[PDB]
Amino acid sequence: MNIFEMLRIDEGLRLKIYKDTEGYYTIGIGHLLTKSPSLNAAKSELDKAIGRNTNGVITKDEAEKLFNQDVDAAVRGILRNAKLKPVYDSLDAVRRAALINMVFQMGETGVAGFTNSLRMLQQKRWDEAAVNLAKSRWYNQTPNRAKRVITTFRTGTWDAYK
Numbered sequence: 001m002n003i004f005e006m007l008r009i010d011e012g013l014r015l016k017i018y019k020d021t022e023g024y025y026t027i028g029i030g031h032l033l034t035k036s037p038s039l040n041a042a043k044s045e046l047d048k049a050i051g052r053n054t055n056g057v058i059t060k061d062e063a064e065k066l067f068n069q070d071v072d073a074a075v076r077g078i079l080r081n082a083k084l085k086p087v088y089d090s091l092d093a094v095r096r097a098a099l100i101n102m103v104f105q106m107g108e109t110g111v112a113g114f115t116n117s118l119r120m121l122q123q124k125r126w127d128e129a130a131v132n133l134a135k136s137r138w139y140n141q142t143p144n145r146a147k148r149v150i151t152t153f154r155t156g157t158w159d160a161y162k
């Protein structure tokens with residue numbers, strides 16, 4: 001198990017524009033295209049992202065390319081963020097993937113807002129951090145996925161993904 005296989009499990013793979021759990025046009029492995037309700041606006045984002053006139057449909061190779069960029073963007077978002085980087089630096093490799101997962105799902109700004117959970121993670125109070133993480137819109141809206149990520153923070157193992 002690693003961050004790519006982990007996010008692949010959580011995001012699925014779909015080759016045509018679909019709507020994510022919030023109703024936002026998305027494609028590939030969880031690649032958010034736009035929060036606009038215009039399918040046309042989403043298709044324009046897709047053409048721009050891929051670099052060609054798509055029919056709202058991409059290949060698997062293209063979906064994996066956006067995935068690679070997006071994982072890389074999540075890591076670099078963590079490392080540029082003054083609240084996220086110290087927590088990331090403080091974690092082991094498994095829990096680091098759990099943080100990348102949250103940033104991939106919600107963005108750098110959103111996760112950097114989990115101030116109290118971040119402090120408990122940096123303090124390595126895993127059970128407490130796990131309880132605090134669950135007290136969130138994130139947990140309530142995507143509870144099975146949040147449970148998996150939270151179990152990864154709580155245990156420092158991949159048990160939720162096997």
Ligand SMILES: [Cl-]
Pocket residue numbers: 049
């Ligand atoms: Cl992009």
Ligand SMILES: [Cl-]
Pocket residue numbers: 141142143144145146
């Ligand atoms: Cl879920």
